[PDB]
Design an enzyme around this catalytic site. Structure first.
Site, PDB file in Angstrom:
ATOM      1  N   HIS A  10       2.747   4.033   4.486  1.00  0.00           N
ATOM      2  CA  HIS A  10       1.717   3.112   4.079  1.00  0.00           C
ATOM      3  C   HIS A  10       0.562   3.896   3.470  1.00  0.00           C
ATOM      4  CE1 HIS A  10      -1.593   0.174   4.420  1.00  0.00           C
ATOM      5  NE2 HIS A  10      -2.288   1.237   4.758  1.00  0.00           N
ATOM      6  N   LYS A  41       5.529   5.943   8.606  1.00  0.00           N
ATOM      7  CA  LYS A  41       6.175   4.856   9.316  1.00  0.00           C
ATOM      8  C   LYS A  41       7.348   5.333  10.160  1.00  0.00           C
ATOM      9  CE  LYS A  41       4.942   1.304   5.923  1.00  0.00           C
ATOM     10  NZ  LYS A  41       5.532   0.229   5.058  1.00  0.00           N
ATOM     11  N   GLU A  81      -9.247   0.124   6.964  1.00  0.00           N
ATOM     12  CA  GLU A  81      -8.128   0.790   7.607  1.00  0.00           C
ATOM     13  C   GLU A  81      -8.545   2.084   8.260  1.00  0.00           C
ATOM     14  OE1 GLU A  81      -4.997   1.147   4.783  1.00  0.00           O
ATOM     15  OE2 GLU A  81      -4.660  -1.033   4.681  1.00  0.00           O
ATOM     16  N   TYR A 116      -2.962  -5.218   9.817  1.00  0.00           N
ATOM     17  CA  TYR A 116      -2.423  -5.911   8.653  1.00  0.00           C
ATOM     18  C   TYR A 116      -2.927  -7.338   8.497  1.00  0.00           C
ATOM     19  CZ  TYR A 116       0.982  -2.121   8.063  1.00  0.00           C
ATOM     20  OH  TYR A 116       1.609  -0.910   7.829  1.00  0.00           O
ATOM     21  N   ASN A 162      10.148   1.978   3.989  1.00  0.00           N
ATOM     22  CA  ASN A 162       9.723   2.713   2.809  1.00  0.00           C
ATOM     23  C   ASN A 162       8.773   3.856   3.152  1.00  0.00           C
ATOM     24  OD1 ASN A 162       7.442   1.188   3.313  1.00  0.00           O
ATOM     25  ND2 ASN A 162       7.215   0.471   1.196  1.00  0.00           N
TER      26      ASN A 162
END
Lengths: 141, 141, 141, 141
Positions: free
Chosen positions: C119, C10, C130, C50, C116
């Site tokens: 993913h 990310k 995905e 998403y 965070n």
């Protein structure tokens, strides 16, 4: 000389359903399609593609239009391709194209000066830049 | 001047598990990664990438090696990148690299002259060609 | 069973300079990287990626964050990869990760619950979706 | 139901110069082109694409043919697309197509059973696999 040039079928011609007819024309005129894909310019990428014209009054409108829907780019190869492709597409203003070049891409599928169906590289220097902007060497087959 | 250069992590370094350590080094040296991907050269595409060296005695061996497994290319951007990246990777011969530049990429992860972990553009002219060969403008982010 | 899972590094971890260290970890844990690339999600493409979470309160913030800068995706292959990769990355909340899994990716490189670092596919069903969303079969090498 | 299917224009039709005419037909039949590109199958990738038929007597010949020159794939979307596209392309054997479906793609541009101009997904299950094999979600626009 054998040359490569870039065309992009613009969203107006895409929406009219002209993609196949446009590719057919360049094939029948004897050009080799060396690369081809559908993609969508982000506004940032459209602005980079058209970097040399960034100071022109129409620039933001052009960027918006060329990022307003998917487009199809192709690399065309053949003798004198850059100039010959420009001849086939016709005058910038689609209405002028209808008057002087009735079978040109812009006469057939263009609307006016802005919605004029198709982009083509205007010179060997722009062709070099534009082809690399859209296609890597790995995509030329 | 701020420049862009191309690196390719070769199959020997890939197989050794060095990819992440190699990318980490260039990041810590302050380069911006502007493009990155794993791909596999066909022998034809490897030969085109290395066109300028096509007459060298090692050429077929090089083409075969560089198409023998997946590789990872990256575009690195920063001040004086072409020369600085060459300094970081070290001498062509990995054994010489161990003697004169122990923390260089080739000293750390290279084996010999052929299996020497990594390719980098050797000049601004090659960098221009090599970056376009692997990545389009659409892939630079 | 041997499985494939998708990770995305990310923008927070990209900006921290952690990309190489993160890839190194998965390589050393014995995963095969089968595909890898840097790209930039448009907000529309992030929202599609998403899709299953589109009704969650944080959704627009997530879409914006994941389209706010370039990211790097990789397909990882190995025994029990989906669950093992989730173990390596640690708890969703990076602060909790620091308390219970200090060497996890999120403990090392995450900031909080939103930033965070990484993913990973949460299940075989999401992994299937995905991986195809980001990489074609032609890109798996 | 609105469906997506994959077509691939095969090297025989490419060589005949039929690409544009074939795309024009599907556009005029009311399909949306959601993805499009020219690429070249390696023999390995062709064999993976055709995995389900790997035990058929013609398999190696098929793999070789479909990797013998560049091809163009497109994702077509519309009501009942999988079956409707199969109707438009006609019988597998181009000679039979000329007898029973004279305006079908294979009647118009096919030669025989092997050089039959075009591939299309034969079912929803194959369509799902084939579309992902050639195009990521990022390429659907």
């Amino acid at each position: 000389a054998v040359e490569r040039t870039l065309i992009i079928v613009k969203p107006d011609a895409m929406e009219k359903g002209a993609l196949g007819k446009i590719l057919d024309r360049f094939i029948q005129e004897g050009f080799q399609i060396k690369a081809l894909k559908m993609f969508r310019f982000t506004p940032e990428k459209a602005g980079e593609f058209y970097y040399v014209h960034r100071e022109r009054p129409f620039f933001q409108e052009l960027v918006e239009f060329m990022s307003s829907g998917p487009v199809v780019a192709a690399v065309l190869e053949g003798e004198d391709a850059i100039k010959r492709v420009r001849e086939i597409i016709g005058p910038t203003d689609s209405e002028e194209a209808r008057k002087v070049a009735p079978n040109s891409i812009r006469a057939q599928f263009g609307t006016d000066k802005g919605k004029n169906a198709i982009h083509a590289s205007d010179s060997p220097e722009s062709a070099q830049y534009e082809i690399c902007f859209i296609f890597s060497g790995l995509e030329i087959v």
